[PDB]
C-alpha positions as a printed Julia matrix, in Angstrom:
99×3 Matrix{Float64}:
 -11.41  26.02  -54.84
 -14.69  27.06  -56.54
 -14.37  30.55  -54.93
 -15.0   33.03  -57.71
 -16.0   36.61  -56.72
 -18.36  38.1   -59.42
 -19.91  40.97  -57.46
 -23.32  39.24  -57.23
 -23.26  39.48  -53.4
 -20.71  39.96  -50.55
 -18.85  37.19  -48.92
 -19.31  36.48  -45.13
 -16.51  36.13  -42.53
 -14.88  33.16  -44.24
 -12.77  31.33  -41.66
 -10.39  29.6   -44.13
  -7.78  31.18  -46.32
  -7.82  29.22  -49.63
  -5.36  29.95  -52.48
  -8.0   31.85  -54.47
  -9.22  33.7   -51.34
  -5.76  35.11  -50.9
  -5.34  35.72  -54.71
  -8.49  37.98  -54.87
  -7.36  39.9   -51.72
  -3.83  40.36  -53.06
  -5.24  41.96  -56.27
  -7.34  44.39  -54.17
  -4.39  45.32  -51.89
  -2.14  45.95  -54.8
  -4.76  47.86  -56.77
  -4.74  50.74  -54.32
  -0.91  50.62  -54.3
  -0.88  51.12  -58.04
  -3.56  53.89  -57.89
  -6.15  51.6   -59.7
  -8.99  49.13  -59.23
  -8.58  45.32  -59.04
 -11.25  45.06  -61.72
  -8.61  45.97  -64.32
  -5.74  43.92  -62.88
  -4.89  40.41  -64.36
  -3.81  37.44  -62.27
  -1.06  36.38  -64.65
   0.04  39.96  -65.6
   3.17  41.29  -63.97
   2.79  43.94  -61.27
   5.84  45.65  -62.73
   4.14  45.95  -66.13
   1.26  47.88  -64.45
   3.86  50.05  -62.64
   5.04  48.09  -59.51
   8.4   49.52  -58.62
  11.14  49.08  -55.98
   9.42  51.42  -53.49
   5.83  50.11  -53.87
   7.04  46.45  -53.77
   8.77  46.97  -50.35
   5.74  48.68  -48.78
   3.23  46.21  -50.29
   5.28  43.2   -49.23
   4.69  44.28  -45.64
   0.85  44.68  -45.9
   0.83  41.04  -47.17
   2.66  39.8   -44.04
   0.38  41.6   -41.74
  -2.7   40.29  -43.51
  -1.65  36.52  -43.26
   0.75  36.93  -40.21
   3.92  36.08  -42.07
   7.52  37.37  -42.76
   8.34  38.28  -46.4
  10.35  40.9   -48.17
  10.93  42.74  -51.49
  12.48  39.67  -52.98
   8.93  38.12  -53.06
   7.74  40.7   -55.62
  10.74  39.89  -57.69
  10.16  36.09  -57.47
   6.42  36.1   -58.11
   5.58  39.18  -60.21
   1.88  37.76  -60.54
  -0.85  37.03  -57.95
  -1.09  33.47  -59.12
   2.43  32.53  -57.95
   2.51  35.1   -55.12
  -0.62  33.59  -53.54
   0.75  30.02  -54.3
   3.6   30.68  -51.87
   1.63  32.57  -49.17
  -1.01  29.8   -48.96
   1.78  27.32  -47.97
   3.31  29.62  -45.32
   0.09  30.1   -43.42
  -0.75  26.42  -43.93
   2.56  25.46  -42.29
   2.27  28.01  -39.36
  -1.0   26.29  -38.31
   0.01  22.61  -38.66
């Protein structure tokens, strides 16, 4: 996955949903949830360290499901406090629902 957003130019309607493609989106979705910008969020930093709580984790877990058409809960935030692992799991769910 040589998909690295740098802000040089926009990305088109990419059909696929690679691991990194989900990872970058997750950062963006969670940035707004933490009242910040994804530009300052790390991929291996814990959402909780930034301020992800029990409330935000439950609402955010839903937006994720709606984005990739899955079923997940608050326990996900607790199992994968970083985008790296979070995305790792999601990528397998959508890859199984279509095979």
